[PDB]
Design a binder for this molecule. Structure first.
Ligand SMILES: N#Cc1ccc(N2CCN(Cc3ccc(COc4cccc5c4CN([C@H]4CCC(=O)NC4=O)C5=O)cc3)CC2)c(F)c1
Ligand SMILES: N#Cc1ccc(N2CCN(Cc3ccc(COc4cccc5c4CN([C@H]4CCC(=O)NC4=O)C5=O)cc3)CC2)c(F)c1
Ligand SMILES: [Zn+2]
Ligand SMILES: [Zn+2]
Ligand SMILES: [Zn+2]
Ligand SMILES: [Zn+2]
Lengths: 27, 312, 300, 27
């Protein structure tokens, strides 16, 4: 349900989404 | 796939007589686009910001052409650029957000002389259209096609542009090379020299690694294959506007997949997609495509984003 | 507090004093409270009361300086002293944006800026204002349209002052002279963001736009000065997550009379996000609410 | 009481305050 706007990768928990979004920006 | 069926169906199709060489023109610049566009390459765009929708609506009624700058530092650092002409346009609105969907094609290179932003907010660039040199290049073009068959044209037909200038740009648009080297070819005005540098490049490129770690090979030129008429590389736009320049290869290594496949908004119809990431740094590298039926000629493939890969 | 309209003409060039400690992106119309203790700072405010009462708050994009800024007009002033230390407390209001042409420092350390009052381009699209307002009311539900301005320029700046957006977005606006371009960008913001997160880890969603509520006329956001001059722009929301509280509530210097405050910090990185406010009387309807510091959040 | 000037966070131990302030500074 938590989907990244750049690549489409979906996660069960938002904490996983947030730290994935932070990878698209180097961190 | 190059037709971009995903963006829309009922899209208006338009094309226009090109600006003459050494002409000085004033062209609006899309500030968001951050690509080294190559003449002949198609650029799909989904615009949501009201300012961009206002400009492109304005552009459809004049010359359908805007400028895509070439940033080396981006902090606006563009000395060169390419023009793009809208050939397909569709107005759309969902979720209370008004959407403009365009398909543009790179037409001409130019040198930036002046960038200024108007009172309306749109940024305008005065450009000087660079000349397109040509000549006799049969030898070079033959040398290129051959090395091309030894990569992907093993099973790929030689349906490539006859014009040296057009050939120089197809090779330029579908070459697994970093930006700083792509801009070099666009800075050459003579087709013949462009074709030469391309050859010297094709012979010196072997592997693709991840850029954030630089310690992991993902695939090899021998894996490159074309599922479209765009050659091995093409640009596709995702449902939130992100344009990705996709290199299709048959097999890749050092990637971890993220979850289960999806079929939504797939850029290659009949295939499903799963995000692919580097096993060492976890940076997004692309997507793995899996057929959804057994009759599919290729069954599984990889579409990688040039933004995440670096040569050798 | 002595209550107290300097309006420089467009494209006029002025030399305005700059409060250095201040590190904010002031929006015209937004109020800025200050508590000053450095002899030089009090000297400056005492001089400013005697002339045109306006100073400049630079909009630093770091890499330090800054290319723009907003003028601030002192409208409330009170002087007192504690520990023989003389403190000046002022309330100023943002009035006009400017391009910084030259920044120079005085012997006292107070900086002087030669600036150009930027013009305020306006336009139409009441349809844009009606849409923004609608989206805003759904976000807060306590908003009073009749408490919102009608002027396109004024409305754009109210929205610009009460939107939970990072400085980098606050700087992008203000830099736009066209109200319409400003309003449009505000819409693009409101339509592309629903959640707020901790800036230092960006791994914790703290609250959502549906939780934002207005406890006063200044709207869902507001600036407050703590007992030491630290200025905080506080976004008040009803509910928040991923926060740990530090200790027992305190009532000292409560910016919201009636409510106690306990510092709140990120569960993952432990960085300050704001304060939880809890009523001290059963009569108050909110009972519990959160005041998040704009400096510690970032939009999705 | 080992109070922080920036937010008012009070602490029983000085070292607890010290590592709290360093989360504001170098923020
Ligand atoms: N302002 C504003 C504004 C913002 C966003 C807006 N939205 C409106 C409604 N949303 C519909 C919807 C939701 C969810 C999906 C799932 O697919 C997703 C999701 C997220 C990222 C990616 C993908 C696919 N994908 C690539 C890789 C693989 C491949 O082969 N092809 C691709 O597309 C991605 O990168 C699809 C469509 C979408 C748009 C809007 F209407 C206005
Ligand atoms: N040169 C010089 C010079 C410098 C400073 C001087 N002053 C002298 C007098 N001191 C009075 C006093 C001390 C201690 C307190 C405890 O509360 C504190 C402490 C520290 C930070 C914060 C808070 C509360 N809080 C937020 C929470 C949310 C809310 O609702 N409101 C807020 O304020 C904070 O951020 C209150 C008042 C203050 C200092 C001086 F006399 C000279
Ligand atoms: Zn992603
Ligand atoms: Zn990597
Ligand atoms: Zn955090
Ligand atoms: Zn603190």
């Amino acid at each position: 349900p938590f989907q990244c706007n750049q690549c489409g990768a979906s996660f069960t928990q938002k904490g996983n989404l947030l730290r994935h979004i932070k990878l698209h920006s180097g961190e | 796939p190059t037709s971009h069926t995903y963006l829309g169906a009922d899209m208006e199709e338009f094309g226009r007589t090109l600006h003459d060489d050494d002409s000085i023109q004033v062209i609006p610049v899309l500030p968001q686009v951050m690509m080294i566009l190559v003449p002949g390459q198609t650029l799909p765009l989904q615009l949501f910001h009201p300012q961009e929708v206002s400009m492109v609506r304005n552009l459809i009624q004049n010359d359908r052409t805007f400028a895509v700058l070439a940033y080396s530092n981006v902090e606006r650092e563009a000395e060169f650029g390419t023009t793009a002409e809208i050939y397909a346009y569709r107005e759309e609105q969902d979720f209370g957000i008004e959407i403009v969907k365009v398909k543009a094609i790179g037409r001409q290179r130019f040198k930036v002389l002046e960038l200024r932003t108007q009172s309306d907010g749109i940024q305008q660039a005065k450009v000087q259209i660079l000349p397109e040199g040509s000549g006799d290049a049969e030898t070079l073009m033959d040398r290129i096609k051959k090395q091309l068959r030894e990569w992907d044209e093993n099973l790929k037909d030689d349906s490539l542009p006859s014009n040296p200038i057009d050939f120089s740009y197809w090779v330029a648009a579908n070459l697994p090379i970093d930006d700083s080297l792509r801009i070099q070819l666009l800075k050459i005005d003579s087709a013949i020299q462009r074709l030469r540098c391309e050859l010297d490049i094709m012979n010196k490129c072997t592997s693709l690694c991840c850029k954030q770690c630089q310690e992991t090979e993902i695939t090899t030129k021998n894996e490159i294959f074309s599922l479209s008429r765009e050659g091995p590389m093409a640009a596709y736009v995702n449902p939130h506007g992100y344009v990705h320049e996709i290199l299709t290869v048959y097999k890749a290594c050092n990637l971890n997949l993220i979850g289960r496949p999806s079929t939504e908004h797939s850029w290659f119809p009949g295939y499903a997609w799963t995000v692919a990431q580097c096993k060492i740094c976890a940076s997004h590298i692309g997507w793995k495509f899996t057929a959804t039926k057994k009759d599919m000629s290729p069954q599984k493939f990889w579409g990688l984003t040039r933004s995440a890969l670096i040569p050798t």
